[PDB]
Subunit: 257 residues, 4 copies
């Protein structure tokens, strides 16, 4: 029997909304492994759900932070230094595109919608990585979440496909710059899962149904399958792995037709 024991480790998970959140799936696994966890949530409307999540984890520190505001980000990381002293793990589970941009055609996307989508969904990784750098200890790491439409055309996913391409490229450049300090940076490419952010997408049930009928495992993945991969990548079992996009999608992405 092998064990993963993260007692003594300090983790920050950004982007929790409810118990179906993929960020919450990872936090739950890190907690279960023995890490001390903090969560950040977007806005005050979400605080009561976030309190429910800290309760479900059996205890978590909570912070509010909108990633479009640099001063809210400075406050988050000063708060982390005071509450933790330093940091081992950072999970980035944040994305957004305007509903107007996600129906219809990518070619028809308005300038300010496209810019907002890229700002929240890709630049936010660079912003949080810069601020985490002085805190992050040797052996520490950052993990983000992505999707296959960065590589191949999924109708209706539109500007989000382009933001995910920008995020994956940022993962590689950040792995190069943080590696000399012993810090790793990786991405998880998840298959469809029923979440707040996912079901708002107009394509969702159509692709959810397609995956189950075409993927090698003949089913969709679960949020727990994403949590286990995040746990592994952050843990010392993954100490030779940096700069990587790892797929947890029941093999859907390897299929043609």
């Amino acid at each position: 029997m092998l064990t993963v024991d993260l007692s003594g480790k300090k983790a920050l998970v950004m982007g929790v909304t409810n118990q179906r959140s993929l960020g919450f799936a990872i936090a739950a696994k890190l907690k279960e492994a023995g890490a001390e966890v903090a969560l950040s949530y977007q806005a005050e409307r979400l605080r009561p759900e976030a309190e429910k999540l800290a309760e479900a984890l059996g205890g978590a520190l909570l912070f509010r932070a909108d990633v479009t505001q640099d001063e809210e980000l400075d406050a988050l990381f000063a708060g982390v230094k005071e509450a933790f002293g330093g940091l081992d793990y950072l999970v980035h589970a944040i994305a957004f595109a305007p509903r107007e941009a996600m129906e219809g055609r990518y070619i028809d996307t308005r300038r300010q919608d496209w810019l907002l989508a890229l700002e929240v969904s890709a630049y936010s990784l660079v912003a949080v990585a810069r601020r985490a750098e002085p805190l992050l200890r040797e052996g520490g790491g950052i993990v983000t979440l992505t999707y296959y439409a960065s590589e191949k055309v999924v109708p209706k996913y539109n500007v989000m496909a382009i933001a995910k391409a920008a995020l994956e490229a940022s993962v590689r450049y950040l792995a190069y710059e943080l590696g000399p300090k012993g810090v790793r940076v990786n991405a998880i490419s998840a298959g469809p899962v029923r979440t707040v952010a996912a079901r708002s997408i107009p394509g969702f049930t159509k692709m959810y149904d397609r995956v189950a009928q075409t993927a090698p495992l003949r089913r969709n993945i679960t949020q727990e399958e994403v949590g286990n991969l995040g746990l592994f990548l952050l843990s010392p079992l993954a100490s030779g792995i940096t700069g990587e996009v790892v797929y947890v999608d029941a093999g859907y992405h390897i299929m043609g037709m």
Copy 2:
């Protein structure tokens, strides 16, 4: 002998500022093949420089527009429609990032600098494709430029590597959306070439030395080699090719060690 005759065809070429540029090379090959070319230029203080380019091409219509300004783009496309009636080809050779973003580390990129790089180098393709769509005739097409830094880490290419990843994903979604009108969209990934744009990339020069020393052909490519690929891709010879990123780099990107 096989001959390709583009007489009667109409091309809009965007982003060209110097005769030593990959964008100029493609416009020059379109002229050689018999097409009429219109050039955009960014600002009225650059009119003299635009006039010299137009002369070096053996004649070209000129239109002012800054691609960050939507009303200006609407005006440019109004003039193109009045001059030509319809359009066959669009060459997108627009790339920019602030000096500060390119000196020092990717992790240290500032928010508005990152967003401007992305707006000018990637969103511009969507802005012009949308306005070109009702003008573009069956058989027509759009071609853009990229480089290996999108897929692999090249020290000091920084946010331009991320903008190019966004641009390549954009090419795939635009191919999907324009294809049913009979219009094709492709990217060219060029090896390092001695252009004026190359002077604004601190990483460029040691990559230049590496390619000559280590690529299969043991030399660098020329701007004429890039111009030939652009002409081929716009021509009827490439009528079955869309959504592609085609490398012209003396084979450098296939090498490992």
Copy 3:
């Protein structure tokens, strides 16, 4: 206008057995552009069909050679040296897997059938490249044919998908080793042609490709218009392979 003039160039085209061969389409465009063409054929019982193809091209030189036999390849390339003096272009359009390998599942492929599929469909590019090397002139090139299934799972393509993956890797190593002579090596990944309504429904262009579209890309890659391009796999499939789901 742009002209492509290959007067004085010499081409060897391998693996053509009918006028629908993607190999024949590239041979046709090479001939239209002005090059002299040699076609190989597998055995003397097929001489009749090879003569017919030579006539449909408007004239071509014919050699017998089975790519599993090293001495037949040695004899082919001796004959090419005698008749042409040198070589500019080599078109590799050889593909085969036993019928038993292509019925049923990849996991059930028999050892003998798997090795024969690899030998004919992949090792053959190495064998012909080695023999062409001393003949190939500066600016010369080799081009081969492949398919999507090397990248993504297309059920029922079975061992041929694996053969193509081996073929594309050989392209890259061959580009490295022939590059100091000024010779280039590339592959063309073609969609389906009348040799399906589903491909037409999902392709961005809402149609299948034609064999002329493949012919034109082969000509371009071999021509001096492509002097900077080596080690590359280029897709001519109406955009099909960029799609992440079926329509």
Copy 4:
């Protein structure tokens, strides 16, 4: 505080010849997690070497089979079924090319050398996978080892690069075909480690990789355990890199 318990699970590990090798490293991590391991060995003259490996694993059953011989593979799998009743995991760490094929240029590879390399290094996965299928239980899996030379040109790797491309495509098709049984198939692409089988490439890698060092054999062992474990139940058809980030770089530093 989270635990991988593989007690009562059964592994077959193929292609291991010494203790300082990547396949041994996976074998040891499966044992550490509670699995029982059966080891194959090529020929009876290597029994003494095999016994010494079984001892270094703290005990393993040993089974003779040359992977080019279908009858010998039939015998092995009959012996595994009688011994274990079934199987959970298969580790394919089999790699070989003739010395002559590895000296000089790829373009100079002789026919029989090329086909032998591909037979032993790639077709062996198909041969053992077909025979494992009826024994493999749901949740079960297959893992194999690869190298970045499949995708990118590494001089002097020669036909082994091409065998690795053949192997990785096989991994994808097998993932699709075994998926309905609930069995998973994946590959690990490892960077260079000081191994016996491996016989300044080591120095160049360390200078260039994001982590500025080479990987260890234990790092490879940990990834194999993960992929075979229930923790990876959503993951099939993948080639996962453990190379200190070396392969993300577009030039040497």
